Amino acid sequence: TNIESAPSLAPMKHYCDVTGLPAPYLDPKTRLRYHNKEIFAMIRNLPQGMGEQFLEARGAHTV
Amino acid sequence: GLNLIAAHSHIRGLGVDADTLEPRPSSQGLVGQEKARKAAAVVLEMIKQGKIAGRAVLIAGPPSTGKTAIAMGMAQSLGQDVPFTTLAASEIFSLEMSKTEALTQAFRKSIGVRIKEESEIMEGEVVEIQIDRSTGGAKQGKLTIKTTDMEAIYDMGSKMIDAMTKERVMAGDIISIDKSSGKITKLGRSYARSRDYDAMGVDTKFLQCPEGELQKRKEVVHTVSLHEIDVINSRTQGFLALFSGDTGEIRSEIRDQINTKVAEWKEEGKAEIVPGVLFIDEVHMLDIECFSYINRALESDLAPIVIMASNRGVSRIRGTDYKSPHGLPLDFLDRVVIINTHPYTPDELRQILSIRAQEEEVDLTPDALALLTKIGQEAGLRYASNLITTSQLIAAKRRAKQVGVEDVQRSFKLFYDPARSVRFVQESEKRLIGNDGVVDFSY
Ligand SMILES: Nc1ncnc2c1ncn2[C@@H]1O[C@H](COP(=O)(O)OP(=O)(O)O)[C@@H](O)[C@H]1O
């Protein structure tokens, strides 16, 4: 009766919000997950509206 | 530093042309002994090549003819790539273990097991540590770390929060974390945070932030000897005996198991075997039981090359009552090739004294070097080399910047050479206590 959806309890893997490659790192400032220093450089250089789009592509938002 | 100037400090290698094994007339701090240096370089080549097991080489020659120098030159020209064990033959007369056991451990020390491994290491400056310690502790906490190139925040598991509190990790600390163990080493304090370290004294050093990625695989090449594996397996903290001593006689079946396992690791490709050198200085201090053991220890597949030095002529073998060349039994000498060191010519003494006068901070005037060379011919290389230090100290007492003949003459007058010391003894035989115990104390 639309009570057929199911949550999950397993710990989820971490992927880079930009390249989708695995992400060891979560940026404390913009909260984007990122693969390496090259992508961290881009992420900190993004246009101010773009950071919220990378979050929103995985349904996340900063506020 | 903690290394002072010592008798061999000028030896930087073997001084041989690596392309041809031609000894250069002098280089790397060795002078002359060219044929002996060529032979030691051929030994050095087959040490590095590893394919040949349990050959023994004796370096034979009069005292001060550079036998230890050539041994030190080989050690300096092998470096860390190959195990190099130095044994004075006096050392095996342990009270803890039989001398064949002591001599076994020396052979085991001279074979390396080379093991290559990786770990992810995380390294950076701590931007923050938050730990709630919510009555109990270590409940939850977050770590922020930066390099010059990245910043990241981490939720910490509770046994990592224990590690962080155990190491009193603080904002501004530069740390490395080995992830699989979870140990934290504080590499230093970041300079930008210096003012927060109000408890640290002014003697404290500071560092720049780490550079590049926070995390990378760092690969370590361990080399561990067969002796270390033997001792590790002896008891529940067997390695702890690698330091204090207090290894017993390690049981033969432990060694036999380890030899099989190391052959498995080789065949599995997990490890490589790196045969080293055992150098036995003044090997004639060994006795006839030792030589009988060595004869068959050399036939093992896991035997190093053994290099030996003897001052002795035809001399009494220890633990028996007959004489043989070098003081070594002929059945042992049948297993050994011999390198001879010859006496030095006056110009080679001059060069060695010059090198020794460079290794100590000494200026020799040209006449002082000529006189020390003359003393070297007359009284031996070692004595003239000890007059170098003495003359500099006398020159400094008279505040001279260079050592002059006057300083060498004071040295020669104040300190007797071995021959004048013997002549002094041969004159004073009534005042010196004789082999009969007799002595006269009257004037
Ligand atoms: N060919 C050489 N080149 C440079 N230094 C040498 C040479 N031969 C001997 N020496 C030095 O002279 C001293 C005595 O020689 P050493 O090697 O101790 O002789 P031995 O070990 O045969 O008594 C040592 O300090 C050594 O470094």
| Runs of H (alpha helix) within B185-251 | 226-232, 241-244
Interface of B with A in 148-177 (CB under 8 A): 149-154
Contact B60, B338 (CB under 8 A): yes
Contact between B283 and B89 under an 8 Å Cβ cutoff? The reply is: yes
What does the DSSP 8-state code read for residue B191?
G
The two tokens of residue B112 are 């390396």
- Please answer yes or no on whether A37 and B212 come within 8 Å at the CB atom: yes
Planar angle of CA B247, B220, B224, nearest 5 degrees: 20
How far apart are alpha carbons B434 and B111 in whole angstroms?
Answer: 49
Q: What angle do CA B39, B40, B44 make, to 5 degrees?
A: 120
Contacts of A40 in chain B (CB under 8 A): 149-151
Residue B104, H or E segment: helix B99-108
Of B151, B212, B213, the CB nearest to A28: B151
Q: Following DSSP, what letter does each residue of B282-314 receive, concatenated?
A: TGGGSBHHHHHHHHHHTTSTT--EEEEEE--SE
Query: Is B148 known to sit in a ligand binding site?
Result: no
| Rounded distance between C-alpha atoms, residue B248 and residue B230, angstroms | 11
Contact list, B153 vs chain A (CB under 8 Å):
26-28
Q: Is B211 on the interface with A (CB under 8 A)?
A: no
Residue with tokens 């040490």: B47
Q: A37 contacts in B (CB within 8 Å)?
A: 147, 149-150, 212-213
For residue B154, the chain A residue with the least C-alpha distance is A26
B366-379 vs B418-427: helix axis angle to the nearest 10? 50
Contact: A37, B152; criterion CB under 8 Å: no
Cα(B95)–Cα(B252) distance, integer angstroms: 19
Give the torsion sign (CA, B405, B411, B412, B418). Answer: negative
What is the C-alpha to C-alpha distance for residues B55 and B150, in angstroms, rounded to an integer? 55
CA-to-CA distance for B298 and B280, rounded, in angstroms? Answer: 14
CATH 1.10.8.60 is right for the domain spanning B346-425: yes
Find, in chain A, the residue whose alpha carbon is nearest to that of B151. A27
Q: Cα-flanking dihedrals φ and ψ of residue A10, to 5°?
A: -70, 150
Q: Which chain B positions have a beta carbon within 8 Å of A25's beta carbon?
A: 150, 152, 214-215
DSSP state, B112?
E
Residues paired with B272 in a beta bridge = B114
Q: Which amino acid is at A53?
A: Q
Structure-block tokens of residue B18: 């690596």
Partner residues linked to B328 by β-bridges: none
Distance CA A37, CA A19 (A): 13
Ligand 1 in reach of B254 Cβ (< 6 A): no
Q: In angstroms, rounded to a whole number, what is the distance separating the alpha carbons of residues B90 and B39?
A: 27
Euclidean distance between CA atoms A26 and A16, whole angstroms: 9
Subunit contact A25:B144, Cβ cutoff 8 A? no
The residue whose CB lies within 8 Å of the most ligand 1 atoms, and thus the one to mutate among B68, B355, B382, is: B68
Phi, psi of B279 (to 5 degrees): -105, 120
Beta bridge partners of B145: B126, B152
Q: Cα separation of B150 and A28, whole Å?
A: 10
State the Cα–Cα distance between residues B222 and B75, nearest whole angstrom.
Answer: 20
Residue B295: Cβ within 10 Å count: 15
Burial B228-264 (b: 16+ CB within 10 A, else e): bbbbbbbeeebeebbeeeebeebeeebbeebbeebee
Question: What are the start-end ranges of the E strands in B295-425?
Answer: 305-310, 314-316, 323-325, 336-340
Of B127, B150, B154, the CB nearest to A37: B150
**A37 in reach of chain B (CB within 8 A):** yes
> Mind telling me how many Å the CA of B221 is from chain A's nearest CA?
26
Token pair listed for B119:
């770990």
CA distance B119 to B179: 8
Check if A28 contacts B (Cβ < 8 Å): yes
